[PDB]
Amino acid sequence: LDRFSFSVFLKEIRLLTALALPMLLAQVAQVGIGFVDTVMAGGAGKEDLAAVALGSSAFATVYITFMGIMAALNPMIAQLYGAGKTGEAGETGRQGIWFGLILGIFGMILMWAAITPFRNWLTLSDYVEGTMAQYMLFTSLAMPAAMVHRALHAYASSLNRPRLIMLVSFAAFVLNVPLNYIFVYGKFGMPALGGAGCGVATMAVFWFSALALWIYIAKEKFFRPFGLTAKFGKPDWAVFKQIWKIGAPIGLSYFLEASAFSFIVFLIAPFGEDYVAAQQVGISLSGILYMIPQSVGSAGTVRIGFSLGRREFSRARYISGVSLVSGWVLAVITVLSLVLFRSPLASMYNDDPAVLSIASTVLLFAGLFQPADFTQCIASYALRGYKVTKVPMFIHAAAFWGCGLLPGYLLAYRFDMGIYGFWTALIASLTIAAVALVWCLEKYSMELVKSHKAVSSGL
């Protein structure tokens, strides 16, 4: 009847020195990849009707979705950095790299099926189809999601002090941009197929960054145990089936932002059109530098599950706080440069072709949801991220869609100039997470009382 989210603030003693700061260069090697994209958004500008994103962001559906599963070992493997064998911890790293290759060949297979956007029911440039050499970014770049899960099962095994990935997913991107075009139209290379061939380039570099795992059983002791990855243990082998209900819970919960896909791209669908399909140089600028935000926790997620093995019970979940809060400093000290600043005279026609002469009723949610969500997932990559607990964190987001279902058709009927108006209970559906989660992260840093079953020792 008042506080069923327990003793709030306690996530503080003298932890001013929580240095989950390499867990920034885990998501700055993720700007590193975030940003090839634009170099082939405006790389396949050379081709005009190479709007290509037309598959390339309907591919990375069964990337980021399946990817959910995969980066769901982030605890699995950091938490057994409080065990000993990086190669039993690693015979997961392997057992999954089998997964990231095995579910990798479903990206790579459900991608096969995928190719039938020969379908129609609503609005132009989201059904239309004249010439589709999308045909081939659909495969030439959907034939990759095999190697490309294994190429994430990488930093799904940099859950233990490295980002040898900021090394590569940089000289991965650089490698691709030469490459990128030598297919769109190129040299010696297969120079022709260029609208797909920006992605035969992209996908070619997934496979190169695939062996920028292989090449980092290099700096110290092993995470190489690629002895036959096989499973079989009863009817079917876990440490794999175990990956299962960290995976489901996250993918099907990356189907949060997977209908924050069909809400957002179905309210350009009334006669809303113009500056309402400018809700994408808008919310693609959520995405843009929401990625370094959000994903400190989707990296901090180690330094919690890790310090669970290394049995520092909430000497970790009472860093889950002073990590919740530290880019929650930047949550607000850059929710300011969002409702404030614009897309001004340096915005040309890049990641989405529309800049000059449209409204800032697009900054009107660069606050609404903006830091009242910033973290309301980094509280998940710290829950899940710490524990089992995406188990129905899954059902965390069965509201951050089904609660903002009706403030879906509650802009199109709006009280105010409610361009941010179905961003109603999709900022209030979406700060019923200031609760749901960070309620189980005080039901939860309250299980490391129950678990901390001897409060201190002898000496």
């Binding site: 049995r311 129950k450 678990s451 901390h452 079953k453 001897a454 002898g458 000496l459």
Partner: protein, 91 residues
Amino acid sequence: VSSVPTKLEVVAATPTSLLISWDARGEYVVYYRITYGETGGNSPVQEFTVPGSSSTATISGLSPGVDYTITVYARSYYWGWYSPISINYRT
């Protein structure tokens, strides 16, 4: 001449039986006897006994939610006892 197998932890039970996972940095010359009873004083004592760096093991936890106190034992150099340490935290 020293101090105890100096960690404490029983994480949880399997609400009948319990996990006891404590310090053991090596062993010594090597060995653990672990005491076994409530804190009731009545219900006599029993003994698990283990090897290596393994005060990190698990009990037969018979009786229900009942308070239970159980110490571990160091053994060393001298076939004697390098000190003992207990927590009481039951089911």
